[PDB]
Structures are given as C-alpha cells and as structure tokens.
C-alpha cells in the first residue's frame, strides 16, 4: 500500500514511474484493489514475476451494489500494452459467459483491444468495466 514499497514491487518494469503513478491513483480511489506480486506464465511457457491488482470493484445492478471480484495483470511493458483482466468468482458464484467473458473468466472489451497509451489508462478501464458489468454482470450468485 506504500508508494515506496510499490517502486520495489515494479522495480524491473520498463516504465516504472508511469506504472506507479497509475497504480497509486487507482488504489486510492478503488480501495478494495490490492497490489500483489505473483508469477505469470506466457503462451510459450516462460514465466515472469509481475504485479497484479486483485480484489473487488463496486458495480451497481438493479439498485444494489455488488463487489465483483477481479484480478488485473500489468505486463512489464505497461502502459504500452493492455492489462490482462479476469473475473475471479468465489465458490458461491458462477461465470456468465458471453462476448465479454469466457469460461475461464477472461474479460474481452473493446477498450482492451483498442488500448493506446495515453488515451487509455487504468482508471478509464475500471470505469468501463463498471458500466459494462452494470448492464451484464459476469458473475451471478449460485442458487
């Protein structure tokens, strides 16, 4: 949660200072998003230690607010490349698949396909997720 501790976490990012600025603003507004350092595997099988933001974002739907659980991975060349985004349902939820979420919880949005720094950033992304998940929730509670 400390601005200096974060510099350490992303110390081998190409755009270290950009990445920290975005993360600081994001986690100051969306207080349930925690930065976490974990291994990420690419299609070829190579792994790199990367930061992600994990936790919930508040999404209004039919008059109530839900805390939808997500994980966003910042690649080490962030912000030139988009974050890779997942819904992370608990055992009480199930994924509703569609044009925007596959059965593994991967999220597909036009905002992600069309990413371009600096017209695109983490705040604008989260804003888009809230609107989209507010029309079509990606997780529903189980019976």
């Amino acid at each position: 949660v400390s601005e200096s501790q974060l510099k350490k976490m992303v110390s081998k990012y190409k755009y270290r200072d950009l990445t920290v600025r975005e993360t600081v603003n994001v986690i100051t507004l969306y207080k349930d998003l925690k930065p976490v350092l974990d291994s990420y595997v690419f299609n070829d099988g190579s792994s790199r230690e990367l930061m992600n933001l994990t936790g919930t974002i508040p999404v209004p739907y039919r008059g109530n607010t839900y805390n939808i659980p997500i994980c966003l991975w910042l690649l080490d060349t962030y912000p030139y490349n988009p974050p890779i985004c997942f819904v992370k349902p608990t055992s009480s939820m199930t994924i509703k698949t569609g044009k925007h979420v596959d059965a593994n919880g991967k999220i597909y949005l036009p905002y992600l396909h069309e990413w371009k720094h600096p017209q695109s950033d983490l705040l604008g992304l989260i804003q888009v997720m809230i609107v989209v998940f507010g029309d079509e929730p990606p997780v529903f509670s189980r019976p």
């Binding site: 349930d32 936790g55 919930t56 739907y61 039919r62 109530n64 839900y66 805390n67 939808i68 659980p69 349902p89 608990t90 009480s92 939820m93 929730p137 997780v139 529903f140 509670s141 019976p143």
Partner: peptide
C-alpha cells in the same frame, strides 16, 4: 470487503 454477485432468479 466480501465479494458479492447478484442472484439469478
């Protein structure tokens, strides 16, 4: 905060 999701009817 606890994760919640809307009920399906």
């Amino acid at each position: 905060i606890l994760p919640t999701a809307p009920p399906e009817y």
